[PDB]
Amino acid sequence: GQSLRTLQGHQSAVTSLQFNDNIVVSGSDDSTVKVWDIKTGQSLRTLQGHQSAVTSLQFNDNIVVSGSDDSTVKVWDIKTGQSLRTLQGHQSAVTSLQFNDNIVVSGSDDSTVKVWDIKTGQSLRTLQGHQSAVTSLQFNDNIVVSGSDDSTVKVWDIKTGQSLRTLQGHQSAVTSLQFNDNIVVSGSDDSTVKVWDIKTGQSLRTLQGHQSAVTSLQFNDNIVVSGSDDSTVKVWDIKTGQSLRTLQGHQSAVTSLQFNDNIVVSGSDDSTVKVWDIKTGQSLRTLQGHQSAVTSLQFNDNIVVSGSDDSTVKVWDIKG
């Protein structure tokens, strides 16, 4: 439950983060990405180049990929801080991204998803069809799934670029999504989570119970965990579509969550992170220390890392 390090240096909100056993990488409204030592707290390098807020990022052993309100995606050499490619083509903010060894996939306020060659920096495909901002995306070797402010989820063939399915039924923006070989799970401003058959496009379940927008979700074979503007996290049985637990305790919207077999970790506009026993619904720990909303988090067996509107990242001992 104890704060281990406070990573100070960003000049505005932290929007996004990822960590491994050695480093934290954070993206900020101040238009930079920072690389930090997870154990010492030291700022290691600052990736400067974007002209507006960084919204989204991912990294591996060689590169960082960042997306920005300036409408670009940048690829950086994590080992030197040098900008390797700027992916230009979107007409408005990049909101979401994912990459693998070959390709970057980006989503934008311009309503499109683009597929790029990560080595050359050239666009391969533009996925056209949404009628408003793309908010979220995921891909694999075969398909892209995108969620949009137009209230739909779209499933695309990643090699050809063709729309395969448009999942219709949400009554407001899709905020979040995840998929596997069988199902798509989407969360919406309409306060529901929906489960869909990815091959047929059939709506399989509507998880009803939240009293305001669903902001975040994760699922596995057994359960969905959702976070909401109503300040709760809900745990659902995916098979019946019924809620198992409501995790109550946050005083404002839940913005972010992650779970494993034992625990849920949630971040909130109330400035705290909470650790919960997923089996019982009980709060195990409240991580107090941020001075404004928690926007983003990640955890493992040992530590939580949280990012905040207060411009800091914090590293916590998740046990005590």
Residue numbers in the entry: 1 to 320
Lines quoted from the article behind this entry:
WD40 proteins are a subfamily of propeller proteins with no intrinsic enzymatic activity, but their stable, modular architecture and versatile surface have allowed evolution to adapt them to many vital roles. By computationally reverse-engineering the duplication, fusion and diversification events in the evolutionary history of a WD40 protein, a perfectly symmetrical homologue called Tako8 was made. A different computational approach was employed to redesign Tako8 to create Ika8, a fourfold-symmetrical protein in which neighbouring blades carry compensating charges. Tako and Ika are the first successfully designed eight-bladed WD40-repeat proteins for which structures have been confirmed crystallographically.
The eightfold symmetry of the protein is reflected in the water structure within the central cavity, which is 11 Å across. In both crystal forms the Tako8 molecules show a conserved interaction at the top side where two proteins meet face to face. The crystal-packing interaction is mediated by a hydrogen-bonding pattern with eightfold symmetry. The difference between the two crystal forms arises from different water-mediated interactions at the outer rim of the toroid. The individual repeats of the Tako8 protein can be perfectly aligned. Tako8 was found to have highest stability around pH 8, but to be extremely unstable in the absence of salt.
